[PDB]
Amino acid sequence: ADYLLYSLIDALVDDYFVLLEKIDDEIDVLEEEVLERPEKETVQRTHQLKRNLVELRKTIWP
Amino acid sequence: TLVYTGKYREDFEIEVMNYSIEEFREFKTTDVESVLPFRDSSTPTWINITGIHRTDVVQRVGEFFGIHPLVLEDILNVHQRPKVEFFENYVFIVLKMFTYDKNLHELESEQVSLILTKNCVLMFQEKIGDVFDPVRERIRYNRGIIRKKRADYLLYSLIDALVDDYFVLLEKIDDEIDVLEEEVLERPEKETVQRTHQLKRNLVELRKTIWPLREVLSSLYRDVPPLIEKETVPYFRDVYDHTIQIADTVETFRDIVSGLLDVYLSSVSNKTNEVMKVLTIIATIFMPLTFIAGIYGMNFEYMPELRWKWGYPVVLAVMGVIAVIMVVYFKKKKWL
Amino acid sequence: LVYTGKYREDFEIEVMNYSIEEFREFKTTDVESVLPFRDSSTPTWINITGIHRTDVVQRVGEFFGIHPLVLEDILNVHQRPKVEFFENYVFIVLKMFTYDKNLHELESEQVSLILTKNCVLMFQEKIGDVFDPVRERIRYNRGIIRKKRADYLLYSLIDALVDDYFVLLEKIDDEIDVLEEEVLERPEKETVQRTHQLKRNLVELRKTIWPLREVLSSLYRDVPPLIEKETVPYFRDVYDHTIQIADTVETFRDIVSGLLDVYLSSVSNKTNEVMKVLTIIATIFMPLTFIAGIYGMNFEYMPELRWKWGYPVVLAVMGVIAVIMVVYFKKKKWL
Amino acid sequence: MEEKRLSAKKGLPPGTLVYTGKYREDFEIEVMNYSIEEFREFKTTDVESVLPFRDSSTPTWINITGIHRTDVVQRVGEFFGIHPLVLEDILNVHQRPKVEFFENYVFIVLKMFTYDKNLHELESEQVSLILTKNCVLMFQEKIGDVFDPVRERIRYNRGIIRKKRADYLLYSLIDALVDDYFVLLEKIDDEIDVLEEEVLERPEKETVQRTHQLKRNLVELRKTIWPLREVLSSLYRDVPPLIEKETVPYFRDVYDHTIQIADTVETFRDIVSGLLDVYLSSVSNKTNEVMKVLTIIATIFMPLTFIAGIYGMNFEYMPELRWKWGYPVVLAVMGVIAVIMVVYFKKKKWL
Amino acid sequence: DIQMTQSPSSLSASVGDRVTITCRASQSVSSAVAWYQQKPGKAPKLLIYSASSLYSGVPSRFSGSRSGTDFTLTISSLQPEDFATYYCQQSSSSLITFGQGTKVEI
Amino acid sequence: EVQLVESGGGLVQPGGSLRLSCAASGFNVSYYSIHWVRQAPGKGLEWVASISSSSGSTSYADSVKGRFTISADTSKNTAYLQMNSLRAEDTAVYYCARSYWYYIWSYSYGNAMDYWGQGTLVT
Ligand SMILES: [Mg+2]
């Protein structure tokens, strides 16, 4: 069962990697948008992404 | 030596109770010598001096009950962290009450010192007004288990009432946070920024008060000196967990309030861009028209200024043409 | 050995004997009394003020048989706080600060703690410290300072340093109140000067708090034979105090960062409002300026050859334009 | 994850080891074989003069300076049993700090920094350490390092270094590295001080170039110090069989120092981020003063020009019906309205 | 004791409209406000808890909100089945208190 | 699956005593809190009492405090409501409900009544 515990934890870390790919894509789109046409929606998305990143790091270190 | 530090000197009052299993008495007095011999009664007492500006009464009760002048000057001091001191005959604790006004957002503190000696509890307060009314009603209305226990349970009941008032203040701040969040969501203004900063500072002050309170209750339920008696330890553990709740809530509230204002702060100079849009569109449309009006307004009579073709309709037609061209050139990159 | 400190104003030797029975204090400027105190059975506290006169420092070092490396470290100033363990004594290096009105600077002077046998040696370059509460407790017979050993004296000294940190952050909070008022209704350049100075001061304090935590943990873990037990919870409590101090420093940093951010909002809010005034004036007077320019023409064939109250008609047109502009402003919330 | 193997490079023949850095001026080999009683020093250029030090019964510290000479790296690695991939890691300086544990040795990659005042640039030199049997192999990039205190401690018998084995030598070297890191951060603190003074007093354009340079330097510092912290944690906790388990608490001390350095780096990042905002605030203040001037002249003149055009009129009928010589009256009206407007502006303190 | 005033006491609207019921608390109830729908002669049915959270199995037509101390229940588009009595409750204290009730009728 | 069934209703002389019982099925009363809610004929809902079977802690409304007494039987999985000194103002429909605690903040909690019994009539 300890190897099963490993399998589950490894699956968790893998889906974190998938999430990181998604966040990289979002960062790409957001930077292109904010450098091509800045508005209030762009800065709202930027701040929301920053809060999401803070949540991710507060999760990842423990 | 023995100097009052606080700003409360308005009034003085003594409010003393005495309760037992079947016999209860409560009287308010104004002479310090009247409430002196209560230390020796096995019946639990509760001495409350409401005005600590009169250093004479504090000194007299300290010398009569035999507490060191150091704890007396600790009682007099108001700019003190909440703390607990343990000795052979008496335990000295420092707390801080709080008050909030819904109309005007400010938070006021007031230090209260608690001393337990045998079956007597001494409570030193700065001004009239406290949060211990539920314990008084429990004493005076034959309810609970307050009168079947010793002065340690009275110490518990006072501290429990204090943490209950903390919960009430948390409720008021919850309402304020909800209202302010809605406002910042739809009504961003300077007054909102000032109110947000005031809420931030109030919350950090609350947190700075909260940590020593949790330390005090931890030392109360873990040290277990012989004067507190082991029967009442689980109650102190209960209020310790209540302090844990208070700390977690103030953490969350600080997070919310600090994070509220970031988008609004960063969304400035976008309005300056709109003022640019307007100022530039009127300038660009209307300077050339007045310009060529002045050009044709030259007054020297030698221009081709005769009737010819109708000058005014032609001038108005080219006015419209220039204005239409200016409008067409704009909005190409989504102006206006 | 070479002196490094910048304080040579005053010198003093302060020693104290305290025990269960009774306590005696000795004050002198010479070394005629410090030397015999080493063999005293009761715990004693030797305080030396001023490392500029290295003669006394080297004399007490040679008398106590301590390595010259710790002598050099005591004479050293810019060294980072640390502790060293030895069989006969423990070497401990700390820092402390202060704060005063009208001067916003942080100054640090070292305190070197030598604990051996039943005597504690502390070295300070300048007169003035925060060990008043422990001295008062010793003098007035409060707490359990007299009944315990020198390890309790070391614990009390460190706790006094923690109390110093607490009162220093209290003073910093007072400064934050002043700066908050200034940012609220006096935005200038001295505002950011003071705000950023205080922000960097909080930075320095946060950087300071970490080696103190490290040395406290070093005392907590090893528990050398010099420490006589029944003091580990005290060191743990001091550790918790340091954690609280660090978190309070973090909150102060957050507060002052918010103050800076609201200052930078009020700036460029001023530019926004100035641009608003200019734009409202321009858009409420340039249309009617053009209108007056149209009629200011003079053509040979021109309309309205003779109409009654032409100037009142022009004035009514101007009033209509002004009214619609004011309505637009009231719609936009610009004024 | 995968069994170790030499990678394939498109532009190179298959069995090629290439020095990746940019320093090709210095080459020397320095040895300090030492024991409890006797120590010996000699710098050399012949590589066979240091190989018979593999089997020394006492600690020895071979210090190879100059790894552009892949000859010496390859020869030493082949003689000491170091795997070719480890040699590739040594020669590759475009790398992050890391620690690898093998059956017979421990391989560590570290970074030394030098910050230059009056030319605000941060430079990195990679140093590699191999601890094996009784030897420590140090592969440096150029002359100049941070290990002089260790050298003089060995030479003058101060400290307990000669009483211990090569694991304590690896300790001494890493500790010297971290001490120099503390020095680097205090130098960066001084640079932050001067940059803050400049941006508060004289906000020029080059100062923001300096702020961005400082931000990038701090990002590089973080990306270096975090793997170093992981290396020290691994040395403290994973305890390979080459460390004798008696020098572990010292590695713990270095790990605590790494914690402190990382914290200071983050806080400096925060300070620089604040400095950029303060610069923007100052520039907006200057622009705001220019606005105040433009707005006050526009406000106090343009309506008056409008009124002048209102009276600069041509007509056949005179609805004005001038009475009591009203041209000075109009002049006084404009003067009064201008005085009122400038008084209002002074009240709002724009002027 | 908490007093909750649920107004209006009655409501008249047709199917497809948007109807809102507000509810004012005497003093601070944090967010523990729930809504119930009681058709005549039957037991109440839970619609919303925590002042904004739909109970499971409830159609998304009903919605709730809080702005300080007054709590509003809103139906996006009515249905023939939505004509009943709606109640307002606070659970902040151990002594639960209800609202007097609002009837939605044609 | 979760069902609450009440019993013990009917006519009682004023000043008498009655006992309501609430059978619980599909869940254990030891894990949830059981409420009694009162609806007067042609009047709104009114909370009466609550019981936490595991804890044994009770709470009564001011209207029925001192007179009423709530209880639960873990073995029978039923809840009881002893009603004493009943008056003409106490005639109403009595409901039995099951609630769960939810979470708002670290300091505030609430509960919501999911399942209700059909009710009983007491006059
Ligand atoms: Mg003209």
Side-chain angles (χ1 to χ4, degrees):
Chain A
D2 62 358
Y3 193 78
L4 168 67
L5 185 73
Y6 180 75
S7 312
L8 306 170
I9 290 153
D10 186 74
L12 270 171
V13 176
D14 294 9
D15 189 359
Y16 291 168
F17 272 122
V18 172
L19 174 72
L20 272 184
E21 310 170 20
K22 283 184 181 80
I23 301 299
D24 201 354
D25 268 1
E26 294 293 328
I27 283 174
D28 205 44
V29 161
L30 202 155
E31 66 88 18
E32 293 179 353
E33 178 72 24
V34 77
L35 189 48
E36 208 265 326
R37 37 175 190 271
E39 297 95 8
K40 296 93 179 171
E41 293 83 3
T42 57
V43 65
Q44 281 190 331
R45 276 184 285 159
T46 314
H47 277 276
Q48 185 196 358
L49 201 79
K50 182 174 72 68
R51 296 193 319 261
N52 282 339
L53 282 184
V54 168
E55 182 65 26
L56 291 174
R57 66 182 294 276
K58 283 182 189 290
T59 300
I60 196 53
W61 281 101
Chain B
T1 65
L2 269 299
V3 62
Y4 179 50
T5 302
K7 293 187 286 185
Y8 282 151
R9 305 181 179 90
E10 297 285 325
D11 200 1
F12 182 76
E13 177 147 286
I14 295 188
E15 188 263 332
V16 162
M17 284 204 222
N18 220 350
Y19 63 97
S20 66
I21 301 106
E22 312 91 346
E23 209 273 334
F24 152 66
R25 52 185 318 274
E26 156 197 42
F27 72 86
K28 300 179 186 61
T29 187
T30 176
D31 43 350
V32 64
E33 307 286 318
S34 49
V35 308
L36 281 185
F38 284 100
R39 91 156 79 88
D40 298 313
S41 178
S42 47
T43 302
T45 67
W46 175 17
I47 323 294
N48 176 33
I49 297 89
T50 301
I52 56 155
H53 60 265
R54 293 179 66 188
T55 306
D56 52 355
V57 176
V58 180
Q59 170 86 255
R60 180 85 194 96
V61 299
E63 294 294 328
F64 182 104
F65 280 76
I67 63 171
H68 292 171
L70 274 299
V71 306
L72 285 175
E73 61 86 20
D74 263 339
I75 289 159
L76 296 199
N77 196 11
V78 65
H79 285 83
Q80 205 161 17
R81 280 183 95 224
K83 76 166 173 181
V84 57
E85 293 179 353
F86 286 113
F87 305 104
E88 182 65 26
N89 271 37
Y90 63 92
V91 58
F92 167 66
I93 313 170
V94 176
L95 277 297
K96 280 196 275 190
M97 294 183 286
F98 273 105
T99 308
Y100 210 63
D101 172 41
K102 286 189 80 73
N103 198 2
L104 202 65
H105 315 292
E106 293 83 3
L107 183 63
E108 182 65 26
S109 198
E110 161 173 6
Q111 153 168 342
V112 167
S113 298
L114 286 192
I115 297 169
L116 207 71
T117 300
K118 180 67 174 66
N119 292 116
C120 190
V121 65
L122 282 72
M123 182 179 72
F124 306 70
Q125 184 177 2
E126 308 179 12
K127 73 160 172 51
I128 297 89
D130 47 48
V131 298
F132 310 95
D133 310 350
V135 191
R136 309 188 186 189
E137 183 176 3
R138 221 169 308 140
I139 288 295
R140 302 185 293 175
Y141 274 51
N142 184 47
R143 61 183 68 188
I145 60 154
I146 190 65
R147 311 199 292 260
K148 313 203 309 185
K149 314 292 291 283
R150 275 69 174 174
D152 62 358
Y153 201 78
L154 202 47
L155 193 71
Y156 180 75
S157 313
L158 305 173
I159 301 181
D160 218 353
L162 188 85
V163 309
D164 294 5
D165 184 52
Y166 281 128
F167 275 84
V168 183
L169 162 66
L170 262 184
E171 298 159 7
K172 266 177 301 213
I173 294 177
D174 173 322
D175 291 331
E176 170 150 357
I177 287 190
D178 197 78
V179 173
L180 167 66
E181 190 276 331
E182 205 188 1
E183 198 176 2
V184 159
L185 180 57
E186 206 272 328
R187 283 90 68 192
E189 213 72 34
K190 294 297 294 295
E191 49 257 42
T192 63
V193 167
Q194 187 182 336
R195 294 175 52 239
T196 311
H197 202 271
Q198 291 183 210
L199 207 54
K200 290 188 51 168
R201 309 265 297 138
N202 273 330
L203 279 161
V204 304
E205 183 178 1
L206 267 178
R207 165 206 278 280
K208 207 177 58 59
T209 300
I210 277 156
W211 292 97
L213 161 69
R214 172 143 43 86
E215 304 200 31
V216 175
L217 277 296
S218 66
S219 52
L220 279 172
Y221 90 95
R222 294 207 272 268
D223 291 9
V224 59
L227 188 153
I228 295 305
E229 183 178 1
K230 67 180 177 66
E231 182 65 26
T232 59
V233 177
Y235 299 89
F236 289 110
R237 206 176 154 109
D238 286 19
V239 296
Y240 175 78
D241 292 309
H242 298 348
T243 54
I244 287 175
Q245 270 191 302
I246 300 285
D248 282 3
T249 315
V250 68
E251 182 65 26
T252 302
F253 280 169
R254 278 197 62 255
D255 270 1
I256 287 178
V257 177
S258 288
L260 294 174
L261 190 64
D262 279 355
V263 160
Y264 163 73
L265 290 204
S266 296
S267 57
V268 180
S269 69
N270 277 82
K271 310 280 280 292
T272 306
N273 173 291
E274 319 266 11
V275 191
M276 292 281 101
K277 300 288 95 175
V278 159
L279 188 153
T280 300
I281 181 69
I282 296 89
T284 290
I285 298 196
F286 284 1
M287 293 177 70
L289 274 58
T290 302
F291 163 71
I292 62 171
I295 299 298
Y296 282 168
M298 294 299 291
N299 268 20
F300 61 105
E301 195 179 1
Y302 278 169
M303 293 204 57
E305 189 177 1
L306 271 299
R307 78 287 186 275
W308 299 121
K309 192 64 191 74
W310 305 339
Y312 191 82
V314 167
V315 160
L316 261 65
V318 295
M319 295 299 103
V321 160
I322 297 169
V324 163
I325 291 169
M326 275 320 170
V327 170
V328 159
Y329 162 72
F330 281 110
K331 265 153 83 162
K332 185 178 288 293
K333 49 184 85 168
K334 296 181 177 67
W335 278 59
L336 285 165
Chain C
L1 57 88
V2 54
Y3 186 48
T4 312
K6 300 294 187 291
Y7 290 129
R8 327 154 174 279
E9 286 187 357
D10 205 77
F11 182 76
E12 195 269 350
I13 297 275
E14 165 191 274
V15 299
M16 293 177 70
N17 269 330
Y18 72 101
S19 184
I20 296 93
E21 63 274 16
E22 200 292 327
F23 64 93
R24 66 185 183 273
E25 300 173 77
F26 282 163
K27 65 178 72 66
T28 184
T29 178
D30 206 359
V31 298
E32 95 273 14
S33 180
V34 58
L35 313 161
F37 269 48
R38 165 213 48 211
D39 203 74
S40 296
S41 174
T42 61
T44 181
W45 172 1
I46 297 89
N47 202 3
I48 190 167
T49 303
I51 322 295
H52 61 292
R53 295 179 66 250
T54 174
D55 48 354
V56 65
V57 176
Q58 69 94 30
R59 172 84 205 278
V60 303
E62 295 211 356
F63 198 50
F64 276 100
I66 62 170
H67 200 266
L69 189 143
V70 308
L71 276 300
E72 276 152 40
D73 218 335
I74 297 169
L75 263 68
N76 208 359
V77 173
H78 306 82
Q79 89 284 353
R80 170 172 159 257
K82 68 181 178 67
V83 296
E84 298 291 324
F85 292 166
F86 297 94
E87 293 83 3
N88 288 7
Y89 51 69
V90 56
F91 187 31
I92 297 170
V93 166
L94 261 66
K95 308 283 183 64
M96 52 198 284
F97 319 101
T98 196
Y99 210 71
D100 62 358
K101 297 315 160 68
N102 290 318
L103 277 296
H104 322 292
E105 293 83 3
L106 258 184
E107 65 94 19
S108 88
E109 61 87 19
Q110 293 82 17
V111 176
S112 307
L113 306 172
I114 298 296
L115 190 139
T116 184
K117 277 74 69 177
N118 297 115
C119 55
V120 174
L121 308 161
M122 51 185 322
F123 302 75
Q124 47 183 1
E125 293 179 351
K126 184 178 184 293
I127 188 167
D129 63 358
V130 76
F131 307 96
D132 291 331
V134 55
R135 263 189 303 265
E136 202 160 5
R137 283 158 49 176
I138 280 165
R139 290 169 188 174
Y140 276 114
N141 199 357
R142 202 179 84 147
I144 298 169
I145 183 66
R146 294 163 89 129
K147 300 183 177 67
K148 283 294 298 285
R149 283 81 58 85
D151 47 353
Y152 208 71
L153 196 82
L154 201 70
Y155 150 72
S156 296
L157 295 201
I158 296 179
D159 204 1
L161 186 67
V162 190
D163 302 353
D164 198 0
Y165 276 42
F166 273 125
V167 66
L168 190 140
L169 282 71
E170 182 65 26
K171 291 193 286 182
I172 298 189
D173 190 80
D174 291 331
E175 281 285 341
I176 297 169
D177 273 346
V178 190
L179 295 196
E180 178 182 6
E181 171 72 17
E182 293 179 353
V183 176
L184 185 62
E185 56 93 19
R186 277 86 57 85
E188 293 83 4
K189 195 70 66 70
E190 53 271 28
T191 300
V192 296
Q193 188 150 72
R194 295 265 299 275
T195 304
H196 196 271
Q197 183 62 255
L198 188 153
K199 180 182 161 67
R200 290 178 41 83
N201 285 24
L202 267 296
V203 172
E204 189 67 40
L205 274 174
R206 159 178 180 76
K207 197 198 305 167
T208 300
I209 199 64
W210 274 86
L212 166 71
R213 185 179 296 113
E214 277 179 47
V215 304
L216 285 164
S217 163
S218 162
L219 272 188
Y220 182 76
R221 206 266 313 147
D222 196 13
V223 193
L226 273 300
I227 295 189
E228 287 295 310
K229 295 284 187 181
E230 65 264 13
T231 57
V232 183
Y234 293 100
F235 284 139
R236 183 195 327 157
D237 288 345
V238 178
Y239 210 75
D240 302 1
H241 283 115
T242 52
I243 301 299
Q244 291 198 7
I245 280 167
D247 186 74
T248 305
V249 168
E250 301 308 308
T251 43
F252 278 14
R253 292 187 62 194
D254 190 359
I255 296 299
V256 301
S257 285
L259 275 178
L260 198 78
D261 291 331
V262 298
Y263 173 94
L264 282 72
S265 300
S266 80
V267 186
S268 75
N269 262 357
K270 275 274 173 185
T271 80
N272 189 359
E273 84 195 66
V274 165
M275 198 71 75
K276 280 185 212 280
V277 161
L278 188 153
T279 198
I280 62 170
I281 297 169
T283 196
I284 191 167
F285 277 74
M286 283 176 80
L288 54 81
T289 300
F290 169 50
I291 294 313
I294 301 164
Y295 298 137
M297 294 299 291
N298 46 5
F299 278 140
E300 285 284 342
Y301 173 81
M302 61 79 71
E304 68 274 16
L305 296 146
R306 174 72 211 96
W307 292 353
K308 59 99 177 179
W309 289 330
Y311 187 70
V313 161
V314 167
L315 165 74
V317 171
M318 306 316 186
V320 164
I321 299 302
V323 163
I324 67 160
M325 295 296 172
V326 166
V327 167
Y328 182 74
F329 298 144
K330 278 186 275 196
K331 196 256 178 189
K332 186 62 66 69
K333 299 289 94 176
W334 269 343
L335 203 58
Chain D
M1 266 156 87
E2 187 161 328
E3 190 276 331
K4 291 188 176 299
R5 170 206 66 252
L6 294 174
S7 66
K9 304 279 152 42
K10 178 155 177 288
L12 306 164
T16 303
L17 289 171
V18 162
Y19 168 60
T20 293
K22 64 182 181 293
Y23 291 120
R24 304 200 169 255
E25 293 83 3
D26 299 293
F27 165 69
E28 74 175 336
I29 321 178
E30 169 172 9
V31 191
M32 287 189 273
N33 189 8
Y34 69 94
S35 82
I36 302 149
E37 47 274 8
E38 48 173 19
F39 89 107
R40 63 181 293 165
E41 279 190 296
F42 71 102
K43 297 169 173 286
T44 187
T45 304
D46 187 15
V47 73
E48 328 292 332
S49 164
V50 301
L51 295 195
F53 274 103
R54 144 160 75 81
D55 304 301
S56 81
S57 296
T58 61
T60 175
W61 173 18
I62 297 90
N63 189 359
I64 282 177
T65 289
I67 53 173
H68 60 92
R69 281 198 67 171
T70 57
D71 291 331
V72 184
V73 179
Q74 212 156 358
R75 173 79 157 120
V76 169
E78 185 80 30
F79 184 82
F80 273 88
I82 310 305
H83 303 128
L85 183 63
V86 180
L87 307 181
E88 183 179 1
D89 301 347
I90 291 152
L91 294 168
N92 183 13
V93 309
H94 286 79
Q95 206 174 3
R96 287 301 170 216
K98 80 186 183 184
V99 58
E100 293 179 353
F101 303 101
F102 293 82
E103 293 68 58
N104 290 335
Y105 50 95
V106 190
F107 173 50
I108 310 170
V109 169
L110 308 170
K111 300 278 200 270
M112 319 181 273
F113 284 96
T114 61
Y115 196 77
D116 186 74
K117 297 200 187 288
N118 320 109
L119 203 62
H120 318 85
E121 294 294 328
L122 188 78
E123 294 294 328
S124 176
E125 177 183 3
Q126 162 166 318
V127 61
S128 300
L129 268 51
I130 292 194
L131 160 75
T132 186
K133 181 69 176 177
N134 296 115
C135 298
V136 188
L137 300 171
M138 197 192 272
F139 306 92
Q140 268 173 83
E141 203 166 325
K142 43 175 199 64
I143 62 170
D145 45 48
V146 306
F147 311 120
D148 262 359
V150 180
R151 296 200 171 95
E152 63 186 5
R153 259 186 269 140
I154 281 160
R155 269 180 213 124
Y156 305 151
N157 217 325
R158 63 185 78 166
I160 63 164
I161 185 164
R162 305 174 75 152
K163 295 142 181 93
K164 315 267 283 180
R165 281 82 65 193
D167 61 358
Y168 190 95
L169 185 49
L170 187 88
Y171 179 75
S172 312
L173 300 168
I174 301 179
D175 165 61
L177 187 71
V178 179
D179 291 331
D180 186 74
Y181 266 100
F182 278 114
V183 160
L184 178 79
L185 281 71
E186 66 183 1
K187 288 180 72 61
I188 280 168
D189 210 327
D190 289 354
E191 294 307 278
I192 297 169
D193 274 305
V194 76
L195 186 57
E196 180 266 332
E197 171 175 1
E198 188 75 30
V199 71
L200 266 296
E201 295 286 332
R202 283 82 58 85
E204 288 102 7
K205 177 205 162 180
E206 198 185 0
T207 62
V208 186
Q209 306 284 108
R210 288 184 69 199
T211 59
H212 284 87
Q213 270 186 353
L214 202 48
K215 185 183 286 185
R216 292 188 296 272
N217 283 347
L218 291 172
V219 168
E220 298 157 12
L221 265 192
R222 178 196 64 79
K223 290 186 176 166
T224 297
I225 193 66
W226 280 26
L228 178 66
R229 184 187 61 207
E230 268 293 308
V231 169
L232 275 297
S233 66
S234 296
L235 281 163
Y236 175 72
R237 294 178 65 88
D238 292 342
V239 298
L242 278 297
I243 315 294
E244 309 304 281
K245 91 184 290 186
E246 196 212 332
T247 61
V248 177
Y250 307 95
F251 283 107
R252 183 179 63 83
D253 202 59
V254 193
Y255 175 62
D256 308 335
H257 300 309
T258 56
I259 301 299
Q260 191 177 335
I261 287 163
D263 294 328
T264 307
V265 171
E266 294 294 328
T267 304
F268 278 170
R269 186 97 74 91
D270 287 355
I271 297 169
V272 167
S273 277
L275 278 182
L276 266 162
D277 277 304
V278 177
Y279 157 82
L280 294 174
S281 179
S282 66
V283 189
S284 66
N285 272 115
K286 299 298 293 295
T287 312
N288 189 179
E289 183 178 1
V290 190
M291 293 299 292
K292 292 181 181 179
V293 180
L294 172 75
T295 312
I296 191 167
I297 295 89
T299 304
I300 74 182
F301 290 165
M302 182 179 72
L304 310 192
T305 78
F306 159 65
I307 303 181
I310 283 295
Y311 285 148
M313 281 306 314
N314 311 269
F315 277 108
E316 283 95 8
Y317 167 61
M318 295 298 102
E320 287 81 9
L321 300 167
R322 196 72 267 175
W323 194 261
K324 208 186 286 185
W325 188 226
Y327 187 84
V329 159
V330 167
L331 191 144
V333 172
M334 293 180 183
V336 159
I337 194 74
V339 162
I340 278 179
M341 185 64 72
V342 303
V343 160
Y344 167 79
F345 268 84
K346 273 168 217 164
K347 269 288 207 291
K348 279 291 292 293
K349 296 196 295 181
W350 295 143
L351 168 73
Chain E
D1 194 283
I2 302 298
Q3 181 62 254
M4 321 199 60
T5 301
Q6 193 196 337
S7 290
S9 193
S10 181
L11 194 146
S12 296
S14 297
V15 302
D17 291 331
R18 155 161 290 215
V19 310
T20 78
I21 317 166
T22 187
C23 182
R24 185 161 304 117
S26 75
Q27 69 273 18
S28 303
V29 290
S30 160
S31 200
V33 171
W35 292 94
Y36 298 83
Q37 160 186 76
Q38 197 188 22
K39 299 161 171 323
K42 298 293 183 182
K45 186 180 289 293
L46 178 68
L47 296 166
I48 281 161
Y49 64 96
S50 184
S52 42
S53 291
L54 273 169
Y55 186 52
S56 55
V58 180
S60 77
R61 312 185 299 251
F62 304 87
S63 86
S65 68
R66 158 209 189 194
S67 71
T69 298
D70 43 358
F71 303 82
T72 61
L73 162 80
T74 300
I75 313 180
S76 88
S77 69
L78 266 73
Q79 296 294 321
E81 64 154 30
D82 292 357
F83 301 104
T85 318
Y86 292 82
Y87 290 79
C88 183
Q89 180 179 0
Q90 63 84 30
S91 305
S92 67
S93 300
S94 187
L95 304 175
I96 297 89
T97 285
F98 279 88
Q100 54 278 12
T102 300
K103 186 183 287 185
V104 182
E105 56 202 5
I106 304 177
Chain F
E1 174 63 30
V2 176
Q3 294 285 69
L4 293 152
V5 178
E6 306 104 344
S7 76
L11 188 153
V12 57
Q13 295 280 84
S17 287
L18 200 46
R19 185 177 177 88
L20 279 167
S21 67
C22 176
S25 305
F27 67 102
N28 221 336
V29 187
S30 56
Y31 288 120
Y32 293 93
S33 66
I34 283 286
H35 291 262
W36 288 98
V37 178
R38 197 172 65 182
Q39 174 156 78
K43 269 182 196 297
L45 300 181
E46 183 178 1
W47 177 79
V48 172
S50 74
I51 179 74
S52 172
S53 166
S54 48
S55 175
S57 54
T58 79
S59 309
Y60 309 100
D62 48 2
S63 310
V64 298
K65 167 95 151 172
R67 318 196 279 131
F68 286 27
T69 297
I70 191 167
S71 49
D73 202 76
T74 44
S75 62
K76 263 175 256 198
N77 213 15
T78 61
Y80 310 123
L81 183 78
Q82 183 57 33
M83 294 182 286
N84 306 292
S85 303
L86 287 187
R87 327 165 173 157
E89 197 258 329
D90 291 331
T91 183
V93 180
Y94 283 77
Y95 287 102
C96 182
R98 196 269 293 260
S99 76
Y100 65 85
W101 298 91
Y102 59 86
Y103 183 88
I104 298 94
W105 302 117
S106 305
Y107 83 107
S108 52
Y109 282 90
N111 43 31
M113 309 203 209
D114 295 334
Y115 296 94
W116 297 61
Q118 69 275 17
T120 50
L121 210 43
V122 170
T123 74

